[PDB]
Amino acid sequence: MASMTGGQQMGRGSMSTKAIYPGTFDPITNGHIDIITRAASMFDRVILAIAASPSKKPMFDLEERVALATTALQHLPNVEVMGFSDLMANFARAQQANILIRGLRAVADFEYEMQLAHMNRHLMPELESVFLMPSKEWSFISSSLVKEVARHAGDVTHFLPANVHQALMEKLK
Template sequence: MKRIGFSGTLDPITNGHMWVIGEARSIADEVIVFLSQNSTKQPRFSAEERRAIVLESCAERQWNNVQVLIVKSDYTARVARKHGVDYLIRGIRTTADFDYENLIQQTNVEVIGGAKTLFVMPPRDLGSVSSSFVKALEGPVGWNWTTRKFVPAPAYRAWILSWLHKEWQALFPGEAAGQWFAKLTGADAYGGATRHYHNLDHLVHGLAEIRAWAANTGAAERDADLMRAAFWFHDAHYGHEPAAVSNEEASAQLWLGSGLEADAGRAEEVATLIRATDHLQAGPIAHPLKDALLGVDLAILGQDEEVYGHYARGIRAEYGHVADERYSEQRNRVLEHLRGKASAGTLYADPWFAEQYNEPAIANMTWELGGNAGA
């Protein structure tokens, strides 16, 4: 077969969609993805954004024989025939899928004279994966770690950037603020190629933790917003080489220079919280929200083993320039210090975080000290 088509809204494209496209490539020389632009739907991404995500996802797998066409105000099966495609390919996951797709197939062929449909059945691990399924995961603490299992990397990055942009706009509206969003999520900050842990995932996780903390403790929205602003900037600067000031102080100065907060007193409060995320601070930093923000920053230590393992490997990658023996020595020293604090009940000074994460953190750090993180 020379050419086969695959159609869908693909908002976002999932690993299930990618599997179907892969099956199409196995039986045809060329695959055309017909991307539906439906005016009755309100997708997260525009048609052009979805097209770019699909192309990037295929390019990552070196699928050079896949092209993407946007279908506007027409039947996909009819457009397919116009482009020399006699067959579309669709995945069937359930009997409900079959009933729906059978009706569409009959309409395509018998009513509009369009392309016929071939049906394939995805493997068991992709049987429940759909765009709706992925969208339903969004929001709770850890949603990003779960979502990344079900979508290709370009779709995942676009999804969390979209989520982060909504969070940012709620906190810092305005065109000038948008420039700072681009700066913080770009290559010189959390979006940098060397940011294997202190990256966009770290931002998503922390902001979700703040939301959960506020909801469960009845915290004032003002306090939650102070913590959000501090968390956005707390690792904006993350250098590995010795410097005149700490990463936290450099990040605090970046915040103060941003002009995002017109109230000088409030701006200084956020700067104080950013400085408080320095776990090796020379002197005590006082602020009523310090314990809560440190809880947010250290919450990763109490996640499930899979997420913690990803974190531990990410930290190692960020310090890839350090020789194994020296890294193990320094990392173990830090872990022993933190585990000691957790065992003493002082790692999470905020009660809510202590209840959630103290015991899992002890187990995770013990696991890593046993040499398991590199496995």
């Protein structure tokens, strides 16, 4: 019925889904891998969007972050890894994504996440924020924590894919 309508997003059944999962991923952990694996099972396509210029200077540069993530996620056919340097809502628009994936680890994050979602709704009404809880296994890890443990020789092999673990060891002498 193309000559009458191109069709609306709401009220008309299921549409093609393309999701972005933004973060600094400095570096990507098993927690991140779990979130994106789960998202990629339920949406047609998923972009891991890596922030180029985070306010806090990252341990790994963008190129390194993108390369490590690309390797770590290569086994997921409907996932792609990109860097970006914009508002997540702008990247989403540029990429023609209709879903924004957010991990929801802590109660402290909830207020902030709801606020960002309201802002993103204002910036791009056609973008839906979707929230996934981390698996219990990964619920206490973060990039930051793994780095700090590793800096003082703690064992973090269980928390990272092999490629990332090696790269982290190299960064720490």
